[PDB]
């Protein structure tokens, strides 16, 4: 179980992936990370919240807003579930539901239902020499050796990956990753292969630092079964940066 | 609405009481403050937890244990409800449900369901010249002018009062009170009247300081429809201080 990588995606799919190949061993399909039933743009990656009066980021996440209600009208909720699955691992997720409400009118101004795996905070452990690159609005993943920039594996999961978990010390430990645009991520994987071919010695790829350095901070807004959502991302040269009108990138709020 | 005092009792009764008389204007009957379905002794006054290996107090309350799960097996939950009632006041309470669980066995080691009104923390506001004395395992209340010790009113509610709320700035503000044993509280109200009679000038009563000073810290353990619970309390001379065997007082853990 210490060789598995857990891939949490937007539609509820948790993937038991080979930290080596990146291939699926077993797929667990549950509740979709977000279910905003427009008002607030959630962040599949941690309940963060945004609003569009341009595009701004509030100061409280979804859980926080919940673990701080009633308030003034705010309705909070927080049921927990544990998942039992023999490879037996006890993985637990939390269903956070929030609710806006105006005493003036008589309707639910806003609503959202953001799930999220209980896991230990991510810490820069030198023992982890891997780095993961993720596409916004797409299941593309570029796992590329942290101690170089040497591409370890490319994968395309059904739905966009929202978070990564490694089962350290019997239980999940969230592994920090990078958000890059499909365009740029493909464009990058492309060159990686070209340089790989002309060279014939390894498929290069930027390092989290070079990447986060040379690209350009953007705030991506995606769509999910009629549920919008922002989420930081990097974009390269020649990518438009501001319903189909709101979707896509925007300049960091 | 600024003249009402809200009396939260163990069986779910919220009382709209005259901050002057102490009499009920309107009664709101909802879910009982505790519903431990023996293991952990809850505290109707804030989810605090205790265990009896004598009688000790853990470091985390019920909400905290919930707003910190899943964990390791701990199951948390936190639905909120708002109550609308025209005197219209919007009072909100939170239903906290917790759950213990051993991966070893296959049964729910423990469980509890503690409700609690959303209200602003209590602060020593010099504008509030009242003091409330409460009996453990009884609906006796001795409201006695803070700026003296002069008895303002005596009341006996159906079920034991767990907390007091004052609707300051449109919304509840929890008012700190004192936990004394029925015995002592009756014994006190008694003398108060005797001295009142021989004197014919006012019914005295200790001040939160004299009381909390001359009495003796005890940890009361009560019972509620087959649900035990600890809860600090003061006791005077000649009161036994250690199921009917556990109920009653004990020396401060």
Curated annotation (Swiss-Prot), chains A, B:
This is Serine/threonine-protein kinase/endoribonuclease IRE1. Ubiquitously expressed. High levels observed in pancreatic tissue. It is found in: Endoplasmic reticulum membrane. Glycans are attached at residue 111. Monomer. Homodimer; disulfide-linked; homodimerization takes place in response to endoplasmic reticulum stress and promotes activation of the kinase and endoribonuclease activities. Dimer formation is driven by hydrophobic interactions within the N-terminal luminal domains and stabilized by disulfide bridges. Interacts (via the luminal region) with DNAJB9/ERdj4; interaction takes place in unstressed cells and promotes recruitment of HSPA5/BiP. Autophosphorylated following homodimerization. Autophosphorylation promotes activation of the endoribonuclease domain. Serine/threonine-protein kinase and endoribonuclease that acts as a key sensor for the endoplasmic reticulum unfolded protein response (UPR). In unstressed cells, the endoplasmic reticulum luminal domain is maintained in its inactive monomeric state by binding to the endoplasmic reticulum chaperone HSPA5/BiP. Accumulation of misfolded proteins in the endoplasmic reticulum causes release of HSPA5/BiP, allowing the luminal domain to homodimerize, promoting autophosphorylation of the kinase domain and subsequent activation of the endoribonuclease activity. Changing residue 67 to E: Impaired ability to homodimerize. It comes from Homo sapiens. Changing residue 82 to A: Abolishes ability to homodimerize. Induction: Induced by the ER stressor tunicamycin. Belongs to the protein kinase superfamily. Ser/Thr protein kinase family.
